[PDB]
């Protein structure tokens, strides 16, 4: 579960959304 929840989020910035670690990995969520 390699999940780093700052950098999610700040991937998800490039789509404008939110970012959750969804068990073992990262994901936006959808708007």
Partial sequence: ???N???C???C???GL???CIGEKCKC???
């Fill in 5 to 7: 929840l700052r950098r």
């Fill in 13 to 15: 910035r490039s789509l």
């Fill in 29 to 31: 969520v959808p708007y």
């Fill in 1 to 3: 579960a390699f999940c």
């Fill in 9 to 11: 989020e700040l991937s």
């Fill in 18 to 20: 939110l970012g959750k």
